[PDB]
């Protein structure tokens, strides 16, 4: 209907310390907020910082608020006031958080103060009905879709960590929950620094016809000072200050040492100088645990503290069974804890990881080694954060930690009250340019950008609800609320087109354009002559050492340089090391950049792929070996220079047809045209005319301005992900889930219940009788495959009791890939059937028999924690599958799956 968002942000004057703006519908006029009609919903012992006061007042005026501030500032102060007005006026409230662990402590942190609280997480329902219900975002989405009544009395939904909407996988759940939520509800959003905070406000203003205020402060309660440890270095160096200033001088020095037990010295130093507590963030479970055993050589705890650790560990581990209290981890973790040394990793049994968390808060662990995700976990802030590496593997390739990652993990430094200041240390193992360090340490926080991925649970559930259609979510989605730039695209199109018209009177007649095409086509034909020269059959025999070759990147010309070697590394791609002039700055780089016109620059060895060589020259010149010294590298410049002085036209070049090699391929045809175009040029009347250089330059601007105008017009159709819904709707109709008129069918309504896993395969397998005629023990293992997505494991040999079911899951999985392909979906059959992993299948059947976890832990190499996560996720899948069978009324299946939940739910898991 071509109806687009019409929302205006109006600035609200702010006392020093906050930026307050108010997103409002354009039609609605701005009225200043009313003040404190009620004396106080809640009273805080602490003296409120200015941002807290402006945000709370918005809660008071029943106007929605979005808060962005650093992780030690009092963002929660805003959540607790909202919960207080809600409990006071009796309106029900919900707190929704990204991870379950934030919720389990937050239920308790909220329960003590309020005591009319409930927890809704898949693992547990406590006080299922209460005025304040802590719901994970995932259960809210289920509840909103299920037509549950808990959302009837809610007028405040508190979305903590809305900056977790960015992730592709769970970003749909937050965006979906906000759209499904009624326009009546007012929402308080708690986020860390986000550059695009205003846009989020405009979404909740357009989406819910209300004002979403935005409060932004850069306040950090405890100043953080950033440090870097060069390898093999006596001391730490101050790269960044409390004032935030970047010290390049020290950073290059710290770097300078880098050109030419390490953790133990840094940890020991921190402890001696009272920089404790230190969270050492290692990127691997193998590195973190192994590092701790290094510090076992030192005792960091008092004798009184050791008794307190023993009293806490045993009170905590009393819950476990006597055979269970002797598991290989339980015995081993206590000694490390006594010394003040702790491990926080996802390979940990859950009861132990919570004990480590309670002790660190209580001060009984003074050096905690943690994997990154402890960062996502609530609180547990420290004085010093130490990074055992500056690079984290992305699976496809190893990469430096993103600016955003340093900002989260560095913010666990600076306890607000105990520490006057906070200290952050990075250990760098590879050369880094100042440009990388300025971004990693001083990086602006990542923008909050949508990752709306359509899921069959999204399409199927929306078909069930009568009022809404799957397409509704697409239009109200954050991804289609970037409609805010279409109006900008139009402003450039008209403005640029008017500019072309002012240029058109200045531009000359089409006769110059005719030359431009002949000049441009000859350049285009020229690139084709180069494509043949780069070919590894002809170029490589000729890329001998000492040769004069010219290297050009995209938009960068390095110019003449002398080859040092010929080699194959990384259709194979061949790498030639060509000495090329490069900026004196490129010496610092770990990406080498061509010398600027200002400086002569310094020659250096830049690995160059053969594909980048513009030209190969028939002049080979001497390269001194030991090209390390600045004098030897610069000497070649004088030698390449004499070749340029001796020859006026330029260095001679080897003709591909004769000197370079056998051009059996018809380059003669590209060359045949090249000469004629040169003949067409020059013969063209406008050749070498007086003031031609300026006369021709204008012609280029008009062409490129047209390119800019033409290109922008292509990007201005809408309907961005409709092809995916269209293809996804077709797979559902074919498989049997929905009718051709888009009405859900009973096969479909079962899949709406299985939202913890692949709804399509499990509902289709359920129909083909796969689950039927299988012992509950066999069924529990097969459903595990859906909820295990790890790696670096070898399948335990599977007997026909467990392999035969697996061979049959694949057949349904192969069909779903095939129906998906004929539906123009992007599924690759191999990944889909491999997505479900059979690695932990024999560790779930053995658990079903009644074997203790220790037998189970031995059967597979997986860390104890991967087994616990798979098992509670399996208990839910079983719970979702048993409800699904109610719809089809299969009595055995509902009981068989319910039998499975009882057999699996035992001992240390589900503690
Ligand atoms: N006025 C205040 N200034 C600074 N810190 C405060 C203040 N009041 C409470 N705090 C402390 O700061 C934290 C409150 O903010 P927090 O819950 O960390 O927000 P978020 O988790 O959203 O970053 C808690 O440690 C709290 O005890
Ligand atoms: Mg928090």
PDB file of N, CA, C and O and ligand atoms in Angstrom, residues 71 76 102 160-161 378-379, ligand 2:
ATOM      1  N   UNK A  71      28.238  -1.520  31.568  1.00  0.00           N
ATOM      2  CA  UNK A  71      27.797  -2.662  32.396  1.00  0.00           C
ATOM      3  C   UNK A  71      27.999  -2.498  33.898  1.00  0.00           C
ATOM      4  O   UNK A  71      27.749  -3.473  34.605  1.00  0.00           O
ATOM      5  N   UNK A  76      19.858  -1.667  36.142  1.00  0.00           N
ATOM      6  CA  UNK A  76      18.835  -2.498  36.814  1.00  0.00           C
ATOM      7  C   UNK A  76      17.964  -1.625  37.713  1.00  0.00           C
ATOM      8  O   UNK A  76      16.809  -1.961  37.886  1.00  0.00           O
ATOM      9  N   UNK A 102      21.181 -15.980  33.945  1.00  0.00           N
ATOM     10  CA  UNK A 102      20.891 -14.620  34.445  1.00  0.00           C
ATOM     11  C   UNK A 102      19.562 -14.705  35.178  1.00  0.00           C
ATOM     12  O   UNK A 102      19.430 -14.080  36.221  1.00  0.00           O
ATOM     13  N   UNK A 160      15.816  -7.333  29.252  1.00  0.00           N
ATOM     14  CA  UNK A 160      17.194  -7.043  29.677  1.00  0.00           C
ATOM     15  C   UNK A 160      18.089  -7.439  28.530  1.00  0.00           C
ATOM     16  O   UNK A 160      17.668  -8.258  27.735  1.00  0.00           O
ATOM     17  N   UNK A 161      19.241  -6.805  28.419  1.00  0.00           N
ATOM     18  CA  UNK A 161      20.223  -7.235  27.419  1.00  0.00           C
ATOM     19  C   UNK A 161      19.533  -7.370  26.076  1.00  0.00           C
ATOM     20  O   UNK A 161      19.535  -8.461  25.536  1.00  0.00           O
ATOM     21  N   UNK A 378      25.754 -13.217  34.601  1.00  0.00           N
ATOM     22  CA  UNK A 378      25.482 -12.010  35.437  1.00  0.00           C
ATOM     23  C   UNK A 378      26.598 -11.639  36.407  1.00  0.00           C
ATOM     24  O   UNK A 378      27.208 -12.552  36.970  1.00  0.00           O
ATOM     25  N   UNK A 379      26.869 -10.347  36.559  1.00  0.00           N
ATOM     26  CA  UNK A 379      27.794  -9.865  37.612  1.00  0.00           C
ATOM     27  C   UNK A 379      29.119 -10.601  37.614  1.00  0.00           C
ATOM     28  O   UNK A 379      29.751 -10.755  36.560  1.00  0.00           O
TER      29      UNK A 379
HETATM   30 MG1  LIG B   2      23.007  -7.496  34.445  1.00  0.00          MG
END
